[PDB]
């Protein structure tokens, strides 16, 4: 008398879902007289015990354990039971998922009195599972606990409300899976609602045209950073060659142009401009070359 090997795979009809690094455990009830021999294969490769691969056989079952699990362990595992009657083979499709990576290119902007707009980009790896959403958290730089602003955000942007003036905030955004949230992405610098205004930046492109014995016409470019306050005007200054004293030309003007006059013929002058706002005056622009006051010739 004898009996064929039989295996019970009814526990894997849906499949096997494993979150890294939890072990992949496949226990299959086996029957058969004589007792069948177990053979484990991952893909077209025969598995044998060693490090992460561990196998055991009892009279009632054959079991395969892969610990710790990796993403590369995903595939179809095959169990062959063999006695003198017959050789049977069954397959188990194992999906090994993990948690998402961190959102990319987290930026902040559009800072109002009570809101901060945040935009990000999808993470590189979703962890072998569809992204369920994004998680938005905040924390004032004085406080030590992160509070969740919103979860399951299905967009690449979010406007954080209910922010208080005079406070600095940190922001981090995570990506979510069925396994849970992943590594967070933080903001490059803290976000400050207050932002006390500063003095402007120097003008940038001071150039000259229409140079005579007593006059010159100067043009410059407005600075990029106004310092948080409106550019009230500009101040043009002058330095003769034989001195290191910068003298102001005329009076403050609201335009990016000025015609300096009163120049003495035969002298060489350099010129520089400052940008004015409520907080004061900027640092002077890069001074121009020393230009001789003389009328055109030939």
Numbering used by the authors: 0 to 297
Quote the study's own text.
Titin consists primarily of two types of protein domains: fibronectin type III (FnIII) domains and immunoglobulin (Ig) domains (ca 100 residues in length) that account for over 90% of its mass. Despite the repetitive composition of titin, a single main immunogenic region (MIR) has so far been identified in its chain that elicits the reactivity of almost all known anti-titin antibodies in MG patients. This 30 kD segment, also termed MGT30, consists of a domain triplet of composition Ig-FnIII-FnIII located in the titin segment at the junction of the I- and A-bands (I/A) and corresponding to domains 4 to 6 in this region of the chain, i.e., tandem I109-I111 also termed I/A4-I/A6,.
To gain an insight into the possible molecular determinants of I110 recognition by anti-titin antibodies, we elucidated the 3D-structure of the isolated I110 domain, the double tandem I110-I111 and the full-length MIR region I109-I110 using X-ray crystallography. C-terminally, I110 is joined to the subsequent domain by a flexible three residue long, hydrophilic linker, STA. No direct contacts exist between I110 and I111, so that the linker sequence acts as an effective hinge permitting the free repositioning of both domains. Accordingly, the structures of I110-I111 and I109-I111 show a different mutual arrangement of these domains. The 3D structure of the titin MIR will help future studies on the pathomechamisms acting in titin-based autoimmunity and should also improve diagnostics for titin antibodies as an important biomarker for thymoma and MG severity diagnosis.
